[PDB]
Amino acid sequence: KQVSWKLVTEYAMETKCDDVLLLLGMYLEFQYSFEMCLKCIKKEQPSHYKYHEKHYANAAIFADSKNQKTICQQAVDTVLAKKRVDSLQLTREQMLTNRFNDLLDRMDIMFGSTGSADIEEWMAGVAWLHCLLPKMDSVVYDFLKCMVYNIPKKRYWLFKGPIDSGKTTLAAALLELCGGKALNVNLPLDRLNFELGVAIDQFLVVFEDVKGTGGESRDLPSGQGINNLDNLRDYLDGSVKVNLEKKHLNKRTQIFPPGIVTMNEYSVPKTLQARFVKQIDFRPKDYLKHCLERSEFLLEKRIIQSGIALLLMLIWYRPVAEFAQSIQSRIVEWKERLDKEFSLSVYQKMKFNVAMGIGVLD
Amino acid sequence: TKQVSWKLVTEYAMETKCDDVLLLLGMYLEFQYSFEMCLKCIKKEQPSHYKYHEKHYANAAIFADSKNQKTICQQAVDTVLAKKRVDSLQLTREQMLTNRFNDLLDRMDIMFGSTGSADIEEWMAGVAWLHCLLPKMDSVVYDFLKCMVYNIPKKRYWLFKGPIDSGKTTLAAALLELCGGKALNVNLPLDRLNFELGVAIDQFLVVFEDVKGTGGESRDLPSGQGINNLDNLRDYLDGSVKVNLEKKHLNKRTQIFPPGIVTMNEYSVPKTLQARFVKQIDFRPKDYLKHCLERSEFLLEKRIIQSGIALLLMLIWYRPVAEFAQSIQSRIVEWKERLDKEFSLSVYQKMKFNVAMGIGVLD
Amino acid sequence: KQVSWKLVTEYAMETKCDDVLLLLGMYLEFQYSFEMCLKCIKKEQPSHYKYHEKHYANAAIFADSKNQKTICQQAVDTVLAKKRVDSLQLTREQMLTNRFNDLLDRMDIMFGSTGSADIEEWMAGVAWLHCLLPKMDSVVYDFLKCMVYNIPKKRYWLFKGPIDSGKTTLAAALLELCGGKALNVNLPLDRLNFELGVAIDQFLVVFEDVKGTGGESRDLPSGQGINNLDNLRDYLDGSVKVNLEKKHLNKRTQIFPPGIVTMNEYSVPKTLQARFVKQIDFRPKDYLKHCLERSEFLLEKRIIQSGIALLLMLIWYRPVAEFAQSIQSRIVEWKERLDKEFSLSVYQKMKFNVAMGIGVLD
Amino acid sequence: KQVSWKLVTEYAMETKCDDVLLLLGMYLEFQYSFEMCLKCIKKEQPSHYKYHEKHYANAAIFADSKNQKTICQQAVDTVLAKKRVDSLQLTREQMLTNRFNDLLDRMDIMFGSTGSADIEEWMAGVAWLHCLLPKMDSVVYDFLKCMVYNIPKKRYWLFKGPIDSGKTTLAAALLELCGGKALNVNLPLDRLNFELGVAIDQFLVVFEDVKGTGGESRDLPSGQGINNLDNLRDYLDGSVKVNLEKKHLNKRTQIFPPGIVTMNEYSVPKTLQARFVKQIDFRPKDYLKHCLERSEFLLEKRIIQSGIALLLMLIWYRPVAEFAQSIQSRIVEWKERLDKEFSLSVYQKMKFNVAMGIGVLD
Amino acid sequence: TKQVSWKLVTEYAMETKCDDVLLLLGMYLEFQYSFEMCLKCIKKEQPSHYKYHEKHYANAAIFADSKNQKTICQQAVDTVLAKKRVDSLQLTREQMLTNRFNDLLDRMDIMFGSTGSADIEEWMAGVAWLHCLLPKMDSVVYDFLKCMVYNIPKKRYWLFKGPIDSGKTTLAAALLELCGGKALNVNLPLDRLNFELGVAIDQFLVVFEDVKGTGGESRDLPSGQGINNLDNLRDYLDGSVKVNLEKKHLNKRTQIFPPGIVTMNEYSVPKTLQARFVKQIDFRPKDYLKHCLERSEFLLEKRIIQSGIALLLMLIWYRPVAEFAQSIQSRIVEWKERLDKEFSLSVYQKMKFNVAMGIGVLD
Ligand SMILES: Nc1ncnc2c1ncn2[C@@H]1O[C@H](COP(=O)(O)OP(=O)(O)O)[C@@H](O)[C@H]1O
Ligand SMILES: Nc1ncnc2c1ncn2[C@@H]1O[C@H](COP(=O)(O)OP(=O)(O)O)[C@@H](O)[C@H]1O
Ligand SMILES: Nc1ncnc2c1ncn2[C@@H]1O[C@H](COP(=O)(O)OP(=O)(O)O)[C@@H](O)[C@H]1O
Ligand SMILES: Nc1ncnc2c1ncn2[C@@H]1O[C@H](COP(=O)(O)OP(=O)(O)O)[C@@H](O)[C@H]1O
Ligand SMILES: Nc1ncnc2c1ncn2[C@@H]1O[C@H](COP(=O)(O)OP(=O)(O)O)[C@@H](O)[C@H]1O
Ligand SMILES: [Mg+2]
Ligand SMILES: [Mg+2]
Ligand SMILES: [Mg+2]
């Protein structure tokens, strides 16, 4: 007779949907018969086939409702409220553990019968990424600890090196593995605020491609990013809280999230250099390039820049004791799933091919 | 019974001082589920949750089906904001600070309780480190509090000065948490300062963080307008007459600027600005302080040395019960006794000794 | 079971509340039982104790309402509406008289059995202020008459003198005595017009610390204030209405308010100097300083900066016939209370201690 | 039982009230007993005493209404709608005739038993203004015709002369006699739009005190007004319609209203000079100044800058045949009222005193 | 019957093409009063009033007491705007122009009727003056209309060029009223042009008024970016591909830029811009035109020579009924007959003679 707003809210929650139009579009697909639904039989989208049958009755009524968007907004607000709560109550590690569980759910599907991803091509991604930097898995592990501990004046890493050396690649994968936002600090000192406002409630922040002015005789463009960065000392330090706002849509005082800054070997003042407790230098590697040429899927399926590849790397290299206790049982299941499909020699072989500059799957 | 009680939601909001509509909505929705089979209540994770779930369960169940959830929460939050407005205008500075203290104490009863996740020993170690940061640290804090409460004209600002990494921000941040207030950056262009100053509206105290100035910049010290800007805010700092504070294209309020702190490196302070401070505290780097921390990482990892709770523990351990407000003097006795049952003067003195040696407080 | 919106509006009008959140927070206090109300019995706030009993019934219901904020907004709108009508229909003298009755109501409490003010400390304030300038009570009275008559070209007084000579102290007291706003015109000629918008519907305005140029030699910061004032002739003179804009919207076309300009001794053009009907020179006095050092309470309690100190001075010095007929009986009452508290000799002694720089109450 | 929104609308209309808070404030004064209403007996405000009795019943109910502001907004919109209609349907002369009738209503009261204005002091204003410019009444008459005809490229007059020569005075009086808005064109080329938007629906526009840059060695300040004016050629010409908007609150395409530009003898390019079909040069006159010194009421009561003084001047000098036929009967009544109180010699005497530099009423 | 009919208000709005909510509200409120004792209806002042008062009286009386007046009018106006949107997308350019013409004709039936206040003789005098402004003026207008209607790529823009006061704006303004459209000023900074161009959205035609350019400025001709800006708008002027038009921080619509006119003084036109025009008409000052007007002030006072109605009268007097759209060819016959009954070829030729002599058209 009348639509259950609660049920729409429950769907948005289980789906973690915070987009009102997307929620509206998805729920409306449930108004059709679940009996011969091709979308459900073909198991195309989990966000659809796992919920159609259950929501069919409510959706049928929803389809006739005259307050559809209003119902969806309240659902989306409930999702936003839960993020609000988590942001204020969960420890930093729990936030991370939650993200890991969300990625593993995504992994269960892509590497499952729902069919889509070839777990072999992803481990090849792990091999390639493990040749981009020395002791790459330790680098990731240490980065995660630095992000969780969130120590004043010891929360930012600097990714520095020539173009095409892997800075954006690794930073993008870390951003997806942890959650967070990329920010452009090169903007003028009169809009750099609406930008910093995106950090609100964010676990981490990446200051992508910060352009300087020192040594611009090396084909290096001109930007204010560096100066506009050496003036955000209180933001980077994370000692005192800062006031952040994104338009009238949201405002909040808090310690600015920790993160990374990436730049193409410019000139870094000591006043800004002091803000970074670690600087990783990336270097172009002939073999990494040649490998990719013969391992096109890595780029075509955008595997090396994905957070799932980094999580897979942690599952393979890191001891179970290093993960949060609550998620350990699950990490064990994947370590076994990975050991079930890849012999050490088989994975080592992939690393070999990468170093040799040939196809990872050769 | 078939309709949500807005008044009950307002009561929860009021009890937890919730002035965030999204936070209220999310908190209340967690009460919709049975209280008998609640993981959150059995684990005693959040007081704001487990102390209220059972009582609000029936109402939350109804709230869960309501189609006006946001509107209900908005009125509840507006009530909390209205109360804050009344209190800011009618409570005495001393009462504001006292209520502030009762709240910190509640958080302490939990974090150091059976359901707590904090280790009282590591926090007392923070008090030890902090008591080595400055001479007679507990008097510095005590005197600062009286200064902020009395808010006497011309006697409202303290200058925190010294080299980088000497403790200026660590102490100011802990004081900001102990009394409440906002941190401001006045190292901006004159035609943008107005909005930063608006951040001080209704604040108990304000900290002008890392103010920089043109001069003596030979010490690798950057140039900044911070000093000049402050030197032009006499009426704000003195607090004799009210000033117009703006925020959101409108002077949201004309008031006595709050009292506070100014943290600053080793720049040259003009005479007309130096006159604005009733006290200047000098901070100095100390080998044992750095080395001690390296062996007591928990102090920084858990943000203990910059916590208002470390300072409150310090006052409870060092100051006479009589120096606290009458209303709370009882809780202070409660904490002084539990502090003595868990820490003999022997263990504390060694902690201070280890810090002085740069060993690692706890060992 | 129905809330009376009218009763909430009546409460707002009686306490002249035009702050929606304050009104809401105050009315909500009335929902609790009053018989044993300690706020009421210890008479802590007149805004509370004079109304709780009377509004308790309506408030109990109000507490059950789902439109609390909306009820309060209509109430606040009525208060704003009355001010609008009054600004357009009251005579300037009636406006001042209303202001005086409000200060007196506040004085009845302060110096009453439940007040927290010590009338002796406030009278000591009148003594200190009467030594700040020659014929002080005449200065204040002539100023009030100037502000009330609001005659074109004869509406602005210039307060000029060194730093710390009492310019702001007196300007602040007069602002409180008559009501109005202080304005900063040292801003760029750009964002200057939004500043003038602050003067909308104000009884008077004070251009605080107007800076110029050239005086930098005698150690005086530079600013545009002087220059800007020189270009605001039509605003200052008050012969023609001017267009004022506040909140990004032309709120009103009116005769700019009359007022004061305080300055730290810069050079003033003959054209600007012509905008002032009177100039008062403030001068530092060591005994005024020494007195304060031994009469701390005058600053700690902010007495010398208060509009109340000035009203008390007018009560003590001015003949009854100089006040508006309607408040005269109320003025006569305060004169009697003052004569009761202080003999001419007791007051003369205060003025003697000030002149001697020793402590007004010695 | 329930409030009549229609009746509130009728009041706002008869009162020409387009201010919601003012409307709210005024209507709420009608909720009180009309029997012993002091405001009505004292005949203080026409907007009140002429309507209290009639609205008493509706206002009493209004006082209890829960939608007060909403009711007032609809009333104000009705007033705005009527202006909208008139603006689009009335001829230019009818617009003027309507304004004249509104001023005469104002005059009937001020010069009537409601008591307030001394018609003798106002005619003295007519005398003074008639000595400010040669053939002043013809100047006004010709200006009105130019504003009504509104001929392309022949719609703007230039008021030019030294400071204190009468430019703002006459322009202010003409602005009130016709209706219209004063605009500041000195603003930067990035806000000069929100300003021009105030002209929408306006009968006339005055570009008050336009500052140039030519000859700034004569103590003449610096401004962009002149250039920002020589770029509004299409606005001044009024040949093609222009797009005007005042924030999101209103927008409209139309021919920019005709008007006046006033400036203190700067340098006027021929590219801008061509826009003015007439330029009136104002000159300081010793006797005008001395007269005012001995005729303080003229300035104190702001009579010489009022549109009512100019209307009185037209009633005295202009033949009835020159006014719109519909208003002629009324102009005759005032010509007789004026001839009833002032002999030609009596008025001539006033003009004499002005020329002699003595009190107009001597 | 006790409730307002929104549909009836929408119908009135639709009948009068009222897309202004305030204008609709005010117009409708005038119908609330009795139609039997209506001064406005008895004086036949406004067709939009007297043609509808009686019919809407009953509904307006109810509307007058409604508490949702603005909401009702808004839906009625939204309907008129929706119709305009449909027509802009589905009517042919020829139909748009025809509807435009029927509207001008209605205004003409009234202004020159018994209830009218206009004098047909003075307006015909305007046609006479205008026919002396340019050679074969009626063909210039006729050809321009076909060009605007066909809207053929590369053949959409006419250049109006000549000294100041030669008739460029007078003609363009009359053409703007005859076909509808907006006037634009492109003499702005490149970083502000985008918004001006947005004014052209949905317009039938556009006139780039008084475009100025750097060069030959010796002729006392100011410098301007108008020329350079146009020279950089090839794709807009050509009308082969759609362009993105922005208005209100969003490309409200991607469309073929409208065709139109460019008025311009005697500046130097680059080759790449000159190529953008299919026709250039030269305007020249004429003594008799100026002197004629001085003796026929009514032409300027009533704005007759710059009126679309003067041009419509010109087409009706000079062009063969066959050159008009079929749908209206009947009304054109209606006007050609009344024009011949009021004006013999003798009176008209003298008018043109007087203009040529600079006497004063009508005498
Ligand atoms: N270390 C490397 N050596 C050779 N090629 C690389 C290396 N890192 C990345 N690439 C290739 O070059 C591209 C550069 O990617 P990116 O990480 O965005 O570079 P940058 O360091 O400029 O951010 C990648 O998409 C990848 O295909
Ligand atoms: N007196 C000190 N001597 C040595 N190290 C210190 C001292 N005070 C603080 N530190 C360490 O250096 C960091 C500097 O902290 P902070 O108080 O913010 O410095 P600053 O004085 O520049 O504001 C702290 O996080 C702490 O780990
Ligand atoms: N004439 C004076 N002589 C000595 N001290 C004064 C005098 N006037 C005020 N003071 C003291 O100095 C402070 C200066 O106040 P203020 O009126 O703001 O000075 P300014 O003239 O700069 O506006 C006062 O609070 C008071 O303590
Ligand atoms: N022609 C004049 N001769 C002498 N004094 C005048 C004259 N015109 C105006 N005044 C006086 O000087 C003031 C100047 O007024 P105003 O019209 O604003 O001058 P401006 O020409 O600068 O706009 C008036 O208020 C009036 O008292
Ligand atoms: N060809 C002409 N010769 C003489 N005067 C003219 C001519 N055309 C128009 N005029 C007069 O000069 C004014 C100039 O009008 P307009 O068409 O806007 O000029 P422009 O060619 O500069 O755009 C007209 O209002 C009219 O009274
Ligand atoms: Mg990159
Ligand atoms: Mg610091
Ligand atoms: Mg001062």
Ligand SMILES: [Mg+2]
């Ligand atoms: Mg002037």
Ligand SMILES: [Mg+2]
């Ligand atoms: Mg032109």
Ligand SMILES: [Zn+2]
């Ligand atoms: Zn399905």
Ligand SMILES: [Zn+2]
């Ligand atoms: Zn629970």
Ligand SMILES: [Zn+2]
């Ligand atoms: Zn009470």
Ligand SMILES: [Zn+2]
């Ligand atoms: Zn009355």
Ligand SMILES: [Zn+2]
């Ligand atoms: Zn009618």
